[PDB]
Amino acid sequence: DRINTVRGPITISEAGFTLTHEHICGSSAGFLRAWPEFFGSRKALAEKAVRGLRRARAAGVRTIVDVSTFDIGRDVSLLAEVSRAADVHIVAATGLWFDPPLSMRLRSVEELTQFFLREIQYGIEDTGIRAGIIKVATTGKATPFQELVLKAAARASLATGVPVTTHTAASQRDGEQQAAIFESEGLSPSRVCIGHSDDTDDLSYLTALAARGYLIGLDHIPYSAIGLEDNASASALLGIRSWQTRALLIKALIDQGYMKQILVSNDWTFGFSSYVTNIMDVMDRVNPDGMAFIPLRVIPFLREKGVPQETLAGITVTNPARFLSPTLRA
Amino acid sequence: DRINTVRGPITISEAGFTLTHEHICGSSAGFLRAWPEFFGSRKALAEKAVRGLRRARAAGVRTIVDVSTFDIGRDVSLLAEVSRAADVHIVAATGLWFDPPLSMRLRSVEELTQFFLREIQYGIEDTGIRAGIIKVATTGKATPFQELVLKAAARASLATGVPVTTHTAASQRDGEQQAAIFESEGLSPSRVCIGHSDDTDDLSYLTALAARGYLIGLDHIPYSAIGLEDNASASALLGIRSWQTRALLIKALIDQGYMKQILVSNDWTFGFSSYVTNIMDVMDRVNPDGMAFIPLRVIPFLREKGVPQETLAGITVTNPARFLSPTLRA
Ligand SMILES: [Zn+2]
Ligand SMILES: [Zn+2]
Ligand SMILES: [Zn+2]
Ligand SMILES: [Zn+2]
Description:
homodimer; alpha/beta; TIM Barrel; 6-stranded parallel beta sheet; 3-stranded parallel beta sheet; 14 helices; about 45% helix; binds zinc ion; hydrolase (chains A, B); Parathion hydrolase (chains A, B); zinc (chains A, B)
């Protein structure tokens, strides 16, 4: 039915062009509140986010999905502030990424399910803001704790119709184990996006997941260290495959008939504290378009390669709404 | 001539009987605000803390030092609320414990120094509440990041006069490496408490540190799994030595001539989320007196063993004031 955003529930008709894997700020729980000067100031960070969201809106974006979890330092009051100021819908997330503190990593699968349900059904912190997606992660074979998180996320999705989206080490085919765990919980693949999937060139892996009904998150398109290859930290984060190579995976999935299974995004952010201090600046140097990279650079690139505009509208408008609108089977 | 508390500056005389290593809630950054129902509710936690602090005050306690850092989930607004309701002074902490998130673990020594200084000189979050102690931790030989933390803590102490207090694995003699690192930064031992030191029976380790001018934190006195040795999680936390064994270390150091170097506490808490779910209840079963254990049980026990009350007042009143009152050399 309706999709919860930080300003309240919206209808499918209202979502419009949606970026399905983004961030306002990539941090850690408590960090923005304890050390705002890391970001210059809270005001500076908010201003930067508003400018970038307005940039994206001007390029046609209407909704982003902020897949920052508790342990990414999600601050839903910041999300609400910038959503209002930029007039861009923002869907907030629950789940856990790969920096859970002791108070999360000691919890059982039932306890984690309760937490994710709280954030979806009741609200985040004392804000009343309800999550519209559940984010989870692996980096290779799931750790024991990550298996509990995947199972809890599946259970929370099965109780609410709120989809699950993942971080993968795509080149290691993590999506297969994630899918196997999800299906062992009875979760429908139509409620799951296997993200960071443009990090691999293995089209067989991607098409096989798409044929099983998964959504394939091609969310790293602007990530490339070309021109800065001997920046070790940037190379590790961004890789050295070109944005064009990544974008051509969108075309390849289209050409093999899987347009309904594709979700595209930038995995952008406006603040970034969980890595090297000035990674945000390096990223902004790599992709000055920020969140507008998909509409301004990727869509025209794919048009030039012969992809019809109606296909691209299906990917960027129709697929996200079908993914986000709550259901147990889409 | 003043010590910062969660209710503002206090004089040395106002501090009175002081417990130097305690917690209101042992958690993780952001956790109490995101999942208060873990604790029943925030109201239930606060009520529990006020009841316990009122009982400690009735037993003679006037101040506690809450050594919860950012990564212990310190919520200075909760400390301020319970301090007011119970009429007990609470000193808040900066520093980092052994569960830092990525946004902390990626920082340099200079950045950490700036963060600890912000918390001491400016305030914690947006609250205006300034830290009066710096807490650090090792569990065996320091990791590279923990070396940075210790160095940053020494630098912040050298710039402000606020003392440093530590978590150790006393069985591993961590106090010796901590001392070595601190002295390599020029920090006076008179500004350092080596905590959890009652976790060892190795008197020579303790006396050698005391002879160098360190404060010796005998802060685990009520910790014992005697009667519940088959509870593996409680035994790992609490050990299998009796409270009387731990308390007799106080006497041993007095007898050697080191009464000036002793600090005593309970390392108690009113909420605990960073371990097994119901550890708080197990702890309360072990020590129903909570923070009042030191004045109600340990002081009379040491008097029965022949220690003058005046020596015990020196330990519980005079030594904490000398430790906390800012200086570069006490
Ligand atoms: Zn990711
Ligand atoms: Zn991301
Ligand atoms: Zn400790
Ligand atoms: Zn402690």
